[PDB]
Design a protein around this ligand. Structure first.
Ligand SMILES: Nc1ncnc2c1ncn2[C@@H]1O[C@H](CSCC[C@H](N)C(=O)O)[C@@H](O)[C@H]1O
Ligand code: NA
Length: 388
DNA sequence: CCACATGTGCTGAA
DNA sequence: GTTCAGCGCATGTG
């Protein structure tokens, strides 16, 4: 037909919310989404990615490919020689081998360069690490000297700089999409972010920066994220593309109520010891009440009402443990529910669960590290491509 | 100075 | 090396 093949490359791919979003809107856009490649070094994310996005993959005990060396078990630090041996000759190895073979996973962003970076990419995503930018963390920032994990942003600089000299203009990626946390626009972080925008300009891209809340995109979650959408300046001229004003979009609201799964055997928290108050609704539609003398960590001390929206799901700690009040009692959102909270569906979760390799906290961790899928759907709906 | 809103986090004992 | 219960304050707006 006039079906357009969309080659997507996901740097820091995680569980592929970018790929999920693209597949969800594909038929409405008359697209056929294709793996150009990916970069993800986190074992659980790689395994989960494969479970969610593979078709007719049959796991089995395999030797780990000898070049798959730069991977991580915790997502922060590289795995030891021992840890690599423990993966070798297991079913888990075949997930890693498959990511390499069928999805062209290059694993470590440091190892990406002009000789292995695919040409003619239609969409290049880079949801780079958020840990050194999050207000919940230590706020180390993204100064180049400090070599932080969020500073892996600057590897994307390196890659683009390298491919600019070797690729033709037309072989460069058509669109780029950045995601990160709200605090990326803070006063200390603004300088670095502006530095990055000038470079994208220098690389021949026109960009717009969006601050988007998931609650405005058919979700029951307060989650404000920064997106930088970039289009290759000549491709903008050829397509006649224009940036839409996505910050004004206000879809119908959604409540926590609307994603909850019924069960007879949930665990409920004993909170009889802790004083509390009435629920109060904030301007953002978060309805919560505090627990007195629960902890000294503020963000841990709230129970949320299911008739409003909930807080930002984080990968770990307080906001990975989201307490909701139901008629059966107060309980945490489950891993399944956390997947739904990030707008993956039940079937994505069942596939990850069915691997029998990812613990419950790890499933929440990778969901917390992801992006609400329908935000990316909305962003990817604005893109235009030439029929050729 | 105050009150309020809110968090893709961190880490050491076991 | 893992793991997660226990732990605080940054970055705002008004
Ligand atoms: N040096 C490195 N090379 C490659 N990937 C890395 C890396 N350091 C961290 N990462 C990965 O970068 C990811 C950022 S999370 C981004 C979320 C993702 N878009 C999703 O859909 O889930 C993490 O999963 C982390 O494991
Ligand atoms: Na130790």
């Amino acid at each position: 037909d006039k079906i357009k093949v969309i080659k997507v490359f996901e740097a820091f791919a995680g569980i592929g919310s970018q790929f999920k979003a693209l597949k969800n809107i594909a038929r409405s856009k008359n697209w056929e989404i294709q793996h150009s490649g990916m970069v993800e070094w986190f074992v659980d994310a790689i395994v989960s990615y494969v479970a969610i996005h593979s078709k007719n993959f049959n796991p089995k005990i395999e030797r780990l490919d000898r070049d798959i060396l730069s991977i991580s078990n915790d997502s922060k630090m590289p795995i030891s020689e021992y840890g690599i041996k423990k993966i070798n000759n297991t079913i888990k190895a075949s997930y890693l081998n498959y990511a390499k073979k069928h999805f062209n996973n290059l694993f470590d962003i440091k190892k990406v360069n002009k000789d292995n970076f695919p040409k003619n990419i239609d969409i290049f995503t880079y949801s780079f690490p958020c840990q050194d930018l999050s207000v919940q963390g230590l706020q180390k920032g993204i100064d180049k000297e400090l070599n932080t994990r969020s500073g892996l942003l600057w590897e994307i600089e390196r890659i683009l700089e390298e491919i600019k000299n070797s690729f033709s203009k037309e072989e460069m990626p058509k669109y780029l999409l950045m995601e990160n946390v709200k605090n990326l626009l803070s006063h200390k972080n603004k300088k670095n972010y502006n530095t990055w925008l000038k470079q994208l300009e220098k690389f021949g891209y026109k960009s717009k920066t969006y601050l988007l809340n998931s609650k405005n995109f058919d979700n029951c979650q307060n989650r404000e994220r920064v997106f930088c959408l970039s289009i290759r300046d000549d491709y903008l001229e050829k397509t006649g593309f224009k940036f839409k004003e996505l910050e004004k979009v206000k879809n119908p609201p959604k409540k926590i109520k609307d994603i909850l799964v019924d069960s007879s055997n949930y665990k409920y928290l004993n909170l009889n010891k802790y004083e509390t108050t009435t629920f109060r609704e904030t301007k953002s539609n978060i309805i919560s009440r505090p627990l007195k003398n629960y902890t000294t960590f503020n963000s841990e001390n709230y129970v949320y009402n299911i008739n409003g929206i909930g807080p930002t799901l984080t990968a770990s700690g307080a906001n990975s443990r989201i307490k909701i009040e139901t008629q059966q009692g107060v309980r945490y959102l489950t891993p399944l529910e956390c997947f739904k909270y990030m707008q993956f569906d039940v079937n994505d979760f069942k596939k990850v669960q069915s691997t029998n390799l990812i613990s419950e906290n790890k499933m929440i961790y990778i969901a917390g590290n992801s992006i609400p899928v329908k935000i990316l759907e909305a962003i990817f709906n604005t893109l235009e491509f030439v029929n050729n």
